[PDB]
Amino acid sequence: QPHIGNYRLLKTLGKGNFAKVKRARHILTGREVAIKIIDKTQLNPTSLQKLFREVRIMKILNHPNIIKLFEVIETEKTLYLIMEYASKGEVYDYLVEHGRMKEKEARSKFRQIVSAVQYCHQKRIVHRDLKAENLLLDADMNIKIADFGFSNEFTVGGKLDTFCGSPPYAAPELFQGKKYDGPEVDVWSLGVILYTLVSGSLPFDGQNLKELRERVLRGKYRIPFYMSTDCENLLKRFLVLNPIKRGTLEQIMKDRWINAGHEEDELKPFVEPELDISDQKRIDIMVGMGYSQEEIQESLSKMKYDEITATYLLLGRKSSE
Ligand SMILES: O=C1COc2ccc(-c3cnc4ccccn34)nc2N1C[C@H]1CCCCCN1
Ligand SMILES: [Cl-]
């Protein structure tokens, strides 16, 4: 069975553009991972430098509902990004199989989604292509957002991608030729996401791009009879045609619907904790693998994304049968 570094490569999860993503297993710890594989020989110098800038963004996104990077392996021809594996797959497929979520379930996921996106907006990182296909689910049904920081050509793509993203989630200012790079475009996409979680369907659709474009620009969508008033009111804060009249995520975190059942636990911007790099239990395990204590401290304190960092972080995740 093919390997790369400390990883046994397993089945392909997806493939498209310049990327493939495979399930794999870290041999030293037994932990499952996902590996994004990019054939560098397909890239020109400009696109190669763009890819490396986007990897450097991935390196600093550390949120429980954002797919985490564990290791970078680079050969002359190929870049490998070893990432968290979300074992329950795409929200897209989950909604197709099971239908709409009850509002209690949708709220749990949406609090995670909003926290993850607001955290990246703090660092002035805009996703620009949030969609059901890159909202993933871990073994406990927690959200893990994929491809935050990456341009479309370095993702395997979703089914309907056109103009570098999924058209049903594209903000109206993109169809009018307007600026397309600030947090407001993600806020629109989040409104489309909330609607799809609670209804099982998209608010704006069409048989072709021209029809969908006109539906998005008109901004009108159906409110299902079963949707609560508070959910409808929350959607009104995302799905606003004029971008500067949209809520910011920090304001939306105070919304009644998003905090229902969380009256003593109001949603607030994520505060990243400092990484404990001194866990002697894991350090002793790694010494047993032949790593030295001094090289563990060097790799973790400089956050190198080498085989030592990956092993330490993976030992901090629960195993799975
Ligand atoms: O296309 C499929 C088919 O179904 C899947 C099932 C599981 C995973 C998966 C699990 N854990 C991770 C970590 C990173 C990336 C993907 N995954 N992916 C997939 N995708 C890839 C996924 C990547 C984001 C861009 C749009 C397409 N979705
Ligand atoms: Cl295996």
From Swiss-Prot:
Belongs to the protein kinase superfamily. CAMK Ser/Thr protein kinase family. SNF1 subfamily. Interacts with MAPT/TAU. Interacts with DLG5 (via coiled-coil domain). Interacts with STK3/MST2 and STK4/MST1 in the presence of DLG5. Interacts with YWHAB, YWHAG, YWHAQ and YWHAZ. Interacts with PKP2 (via N-terminus). Interacts with CDC25C. Interacts with KSR1. This is MAP/microtubule affinity-regulating kinase 3. GO terms for molecular function: ATP binding; protein phosphatase binding; protein serine kinase activity; protein serine/threonine kinase activity; tau protein binding; tau-protein kinase activity. Serine/threonine-protein kinase. Involved in the specific phosphorylation of microtubule-associated proteins for MAP2 and MAP4. Phosphorylates the microtubule-associated protein MAPT/TAU. Phosphorylates CDC25C on 'Ser-216'. Regulates localization and activity of some histone deacetylases by mediating phosphorylation of HDAC7, promoting subsequent interaction between HDAC7 and 14-3-3 and export from the nucleus. Regulates localization and activity of MITF by mediating its phosphorylation, promoting subsequent interaction between MITF and 14-3-3 and retention in the cytosol. It comes from Homo sapiens. It comes from the Eukaryota. GO terms for biological process: intracellular signal transduction; microtubule cytoskeleton organization; negative regulation of hippo signaling; negative regulation of protein localization to nucleus; protein phosphorylation; regulation of G2/M transition of mitotic cell cycle. It is linked to Visual impairment and progressive phthisis bulbi: An autosomal recessive, progressive disease characterized by poor vision at birth and development of bilateral phthisis bulbi by adulthood. The gene is MARK3.
